[PDB]
Design an enzyme around this catalytic site. Structure first.
Site, PDB file in Angstrom:
ATOM      1  N   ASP A  85      -8.144  -7.155   0.317  1.00  0.00           N
ATOM      2  CA  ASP A  85      -7.446  -5.875   0.175  1.00  0.00           C
ATOM      3  C   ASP A  85      -7.026  -5.694  -1.274  1.00  0.00           C
ATOM      4  O   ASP A  85      -5.910  -6.012  -1.683  1.00  0.00           O
ATOM      5  CB  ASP A  85      -6.270  -5.747   1.132  1.00  0.00           C
ATOM      6  CG  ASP A  85      -6.700  -5.677   2.563  1.00  0.00           C
ATOM      7  OD1 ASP A  85      -7.610  -4.828   2.854  1.00  0.00           O
ATOM      8  OD2 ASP A  85      -6.195  -6.417   3.408  1.00  0.00           O
TER       9      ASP A  85
ATOM     10  N   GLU B 258      -3.875  -1.430  -1.265  1.00  0.00           N
ATOM     11  CA  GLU B 258      -3.258  -0.706  -0.151  1.00  0.00           C
ATOM     12  C   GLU B 258      -2.015  -0.078  -0.740  1.00  0.00           C
ATOM     13  O   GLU B 258      -1.163  -0.786  -1.277  1.00  0.00           O
ATOM     14  CB  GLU B 258      -2.924  -1.645   0.982  1.00  0.00           C
ATOM     15  CG  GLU B 258      -4.185  -2.151   1.684  1.00  0.00           C
ATOM     16  CD  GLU B 258      -3.868  -3.008   2.854  1.00  0.00           C
ATOM     17  OE1 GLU B 258      -3.593  -4.213   2.674  1.00  0.00           O
ATOM     18  OE2 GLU B 258      -3.838  -2.464   3.982  1.00  0.00           O
TER      19      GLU B 258
ATOM     20  N   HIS C  91      -7.318 -11.907   2.752  1.00  0.00           N
ATOM     21  CA  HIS C  91      -7.196 -12.379   4.126  1.00  0.00           C
ATOM     22  C   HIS C  91      -8.446 -13.197   4.480  1.00  0.00           C
ATOM     23  O   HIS C  91      -9.515 -12.619   4.688  1.00  0.00           O
ATOM     24  CB  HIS C  91      -7.165 -11.247   5.148  1.00  0.00           C
ATOM     25  CG  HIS C  91      -6.016 -10.282   5.066  1.00  0.00           C
ATOM     26  ND1 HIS C  91      -5.071 -10.204   6.062  1.00  0.00           N
ATOM     27  CD2 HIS C  91      -5.727  -9.282   4.202  1.00  0.00           C
ATOM     28  CE1 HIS C  91      -4.247  -9.194   5.823  1.00  0.00           C
ATOM     29  NE2 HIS C  91      -4.615  -8.628   4.687  1.00  0.00           N
TER      30      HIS C  91
ATOM     31  N   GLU D  28     -11.477 -10.248   4.427  1.00  0.00           N
ATOM     32  CA  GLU D  28     -11.074  -8.968   3.874  1.00  0.00           C
ATOM     33  C   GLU D  28     -10.311  -9.202   2.591  1.00  0.00           C
ATOM     34  O   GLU D  28      -9.312  -9.934   2.595  1.00  0.00           O
ATOM     35  CB  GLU D  28     -10.172  -8.259   4.903  1.00  0.00           C
ATOM     36  CG  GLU D  28      -9.598  -6.954   4.465  1.00  0.00           C
ATOM     37  CD  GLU D  28      -8.787  -6.262   5.541  1.00  0.00           C
ATOM     38  OE1 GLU D  28      -8.629  -6.794   6.674  1.00  0.00           O
ATOM     39  OE2 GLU D  28      -8.370  -5.118   5.255  1.00  0.00           O
TER      40      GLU D  28
HETATM   41  O1  LIG Z   1       0.015  -5.516  10.940  1.00  0.00           O
HETATM   42  C1  LIG Z   1       0.604  -4.731   9.888  1.00  0.00           C
HETATM   43  C2  LIG Z   1       0.254  -5.310   8.524  1.00  0.00           C
HETATM   44  O2  LIG Z   1       0.842  -6.588   8.405  1.00  0.00           O
HETATM   45  C3  LIG Z   1       0.695  -7.064   7.070  1.00  0.00           C
HETATM   46  O3  LIG Z   1       1.274  -8.359   7.065  1.00  0.00           O
HETATM   47  C4  LIG Z   1       2.696  -8.413   6.997  1.00  0.00           C
HETATM   48  C5  LIG Z   1       3.244  -9.014   8.276  1.00  0.00           C
HETATM   49  O4  LIG Z   1       3.015  -8.133   9.380  1.00  0.00           O
HETATM   50  C6  LIG Z   1       4.718  -9.283   8.225  1.00  0.00           C
HETATM   51  O5  LIG Z   1       5.153 -10.122   9.277  1.00  0.00           O
HETATM   52  C7  LIG Z   1       4.956 -10.097   6.947  1.00  0.00           C
HETATM   53  O6  LIG Z   1       6.341 -10.376   6.800  1.00  0.00           O
HETATM   54  O7  LIG Z   1       4.585  -9.344   5.811  1.00  0.00           O
HETATM   55  C8  LIG Z   1       3.160  -9.201   5.784  1.00  0.00           C
HETATM   56  C9  LIG Z   1       2.752  -8.517   4.486  1.00  0.00           C
HETATM   57  O8  LIG Z   1       3.304  -7.198   4.446  1.00  0.00           O
HETATM   58  C10 LIG Z   1      -0.791  -7.222   6.719  1.00  0.00           C
HETATM   59  O9  LIG Z   1      -0.853  -7.588   5.383  1.00  0.00           O
HETATM   60  C11 LIG Z   1      -1.448  -5.894   6.956  1.00  0.00           C
HETATM   61  O10 LIG Z   1      -2.824  -6.187   6.704  1.00  0.00           O
HETATM   62  C12 LIG Z   1      -1.240  -5.352   8.373  1.00  0.00           C
HETATM   63  O11 LIG Z   1      -1.875  -4.098   8.322  1.00  0.00           O
END
Ligand SMILES: OC[C@H]1O[C@@H](O[C@H]2[C@H](O)[C@@H](O)[C@H](O)O[C@@H]2CO)[C@H](O)[C@@H](O)[C@@H]1O
Ligand SMILES: *[C@@H]1O[C@H](CO)[C@@H](O[C@@H]2O[C@H](CO)[C@@H](O[C@@H]3O[C@H](CO)[C@@H](O)[C@H](O[C@H]4O[C@H](CO)[C@@H](O)[C@H](O)[C@@H]4O)[C@@H]3O)[C@H](O)[C@H]2NC(C)=O)[C@H](O)[C@H]1NC(C)=O
Ligand SMILES: *[C@@H]1O[C@H](CO)[C@@H](O[C@@H]2O[C@H](CO)[C@@H](O)[C@H](O)[C@H]2NC(C)=O)[C@H](O)[C@H]1NC(C)=O
Length: 436
Positions: free
Chosen positions: A211, A214, A225, A209
């Site tokens: 992104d 967002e 990802h 993916e």
């Molecule tokens: O699952 C929610 C969201 O997480 C996003 O990653 C986060 C992560 O959950 C957190 O632990 C870290 O500190 O920061 C990252 C980036 O914000 C992920 O990027 C999203 O795709 C997902 O929807």
């Protein structure tokens, strides 16, 4: 799933442009299709529910295979039911329409085939209006390594296909999908405790993916990802990983990604209402996927971002986090960012930019969506996350929203008329879509 017949299906048209050089673009007559998971699932004979609220009918759907044979994905009234309209190069997605929340759409090459983009050594531009996206909402425009045909050539019991938006996958290995790989997801289905319309089954659908976007009016992130297998694959159970498995890190895809959100990277003045990129007005988002040798067959090495607003071309700001250098996504940036923030480096574990680039080489589908977050309230995008941490610790603060923001029942009640509008999509060689 069968192709439904209760409601007619017609894909809203959407133009976009291919550019060969700056100022030199031509128009493609595209169209979009609603994701399968938003559709009514009707029994093929009686036009009655196979799926009601968040549970399945046991006569039509005693098991995954039988369900797929007995049940059809209905056509969609795009405007009336889903709040989706298009005009020219513009696609508008409304938030709440009756009992419906948001949408997820794919760009089509033809009525049975998603448009495949080969992003390596290319640039993608679009215009967006996020002015009516408050805390808790995410207008996402992104790419996933779906099959162009939606799965039909591999999975004979998927008769619906891309024409009905089948075949989704992403780096969360989503298990909320009612149909994956020509089978329903009724075996092991567990209704969501907090969403009357959704659940989680034993099967998930994994793929890499990219992104690109967002965002809401508060914050934005760009995030690759990788997955161990770049293209679409089915997982089962806990080992799916992703947000709705027990352990998000148990599977074959990086659920976190290597993200660049300028606010999280220490520049809160850059993006938001009245800021350098002023989210009260539309703007253009340019993203470049550079390779190590600058050719189409090089390895993905750097993802760059520019914004254009009022005809001013504005590069992404630099990181202002100690230890993390520059304004672009590279292996070095990603390694450093995870170290500085104390986040697990799942990006590197799943092959980083090399595996993201391999997915790009396979070809990816353009997704445009609008959603709210039944797991984490979009706090990861626009608030302080996790909510127990000190917001002054690097990596915690991602936007201005309070930690009690973004609860779906709140935002669906308070902001039903919110929307995102994507327009003026352009794609081509590096520097071909804007004034570099
Ligand atoms: O699952 C929610 C969201 O997480 C996003 O990653 C986060 C992560 O959950 C957190 O632990 C870290 O500190 O920061 C990252 C980036 O914000 C992920 O990027 C999203 O795709 C997902 O929807
Ligand atoms: C958050 O990020 C933004 C975006 O990056 C950042 O704003 C940028 O700040 C710099 C520094 O103030 C600006 O750059 C200057 O712009 C002025 C006017 O155009 C120029 O005259 C300056 O030129 C001199 O300095 C240069 C070196 O920086 C020399 O190379 C040059 O020869 C001159 O001596 C300089 O380029 C830049 O324009 C803004 N960008 C925007 C779009 O506003 C901001 O500082 C960051 N904020 C925080 C709090 O971190
Ligand atoms: C795309 O355009 C950019 C900007 O004009 C080019 O990068 C500039 O390239 C020169 C020559 O190497 C450098 O001195 C500048 O520092 C670069 N500026 C920026 C903003 O990076 C770039 O080479 C062009 N890409 C291609 C493939 O033509």
């Amino acid at each position: 799933q069968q192709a439904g017949t209760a409601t007619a299906e017609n894909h809203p048209p959407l133009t976009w442009q291919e550019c060969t050089a700056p100022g030199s673009c031509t128009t493609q007559n595209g169209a979009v299709v609603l994701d399968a998971n938003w559709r009514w699932v009707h029994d093929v004979n009686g036009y009655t529910n196979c799926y009601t609220g968040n549970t399945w009918d046991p006569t039509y759907c005693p098991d995954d295979e039988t369900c797929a044979q007995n049940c059809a994905l209905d056509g969609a009234d795009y405007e009336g039911t889903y709040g989706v309209t298009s005009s020219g190069s513009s696609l508008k997605l409304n938030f709440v329409t009756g009992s419906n929340v948001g949408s997820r759409l794919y760009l089509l090459q033809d009525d049975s085939t998603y448009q495949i983009f080969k992003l390596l050594n290319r640039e993608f531009s679009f215009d967006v209006d996020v002015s009516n996206l408050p805390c808790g909402l995410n207008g996402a425009l992104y790419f996933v390594a779906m099959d162009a045909d939606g799965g039909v050539s591999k999975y004979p019991n998927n008769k619906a296909g891309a024409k009905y938006g089948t075949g989704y996958c992403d780096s969360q290995c989503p298990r909320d999908l009612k149909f994956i790989d020509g089978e329903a997801n009724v075996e092991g289905w567990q209704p969501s405790s907090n969403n009357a319309n959704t659940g989680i089954g034993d099967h998930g659908s994994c793929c890499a993916e990219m992104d690109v976007w967002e965002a809401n009016s508060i914050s934005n992130a760009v995030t690759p990802h990788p997955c161990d297998t770049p293209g679409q694959t089915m997982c089962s159970g806990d080992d799916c990983g992703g947000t709705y498995s027990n352990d998000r890190y148990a599977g074959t895809c990086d659920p976190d990604g290597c993200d660049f959100n300028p606010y999280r990277m220490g520049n809160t003045s850059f993006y938001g209402p009245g800021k350098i990129i002023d989210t009260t007005k539309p703007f253009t988002v340019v993203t470049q996927f550079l390779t190590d040798d600058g050719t189409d067959t090089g390895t993905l090495s750097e993802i760059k971002r520019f914004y254009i607003q009022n005809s001013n071309v504005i590069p992404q700001p630099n990181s202002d986090i100690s230890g993390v250098t520059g304004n672009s996504i590279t292996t070095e940036f990603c390694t450093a960012q995870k170290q500085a923030f104390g986040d697990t480096d799942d990006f590197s574990q799943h092959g980083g930019l090399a595996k993201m680039g391999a997915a790009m080489q396979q070809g990816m589908v353009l997704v445009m969506s609008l959603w709210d977050d039944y797991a984490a309230q979009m706090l990861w995008l626009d608030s302080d996350y996790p909510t127990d941490a000190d917001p002054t610790t690097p990596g915690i603060a991602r936007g201005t929203c309070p930690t009690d923001s973004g609860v779906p029942s709140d935002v669906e009640s308070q902001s039903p008329n919110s929307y995102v509008t994507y327009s003026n999509i352009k794609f081509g060689p590096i520097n071909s879509t804007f004034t570099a």
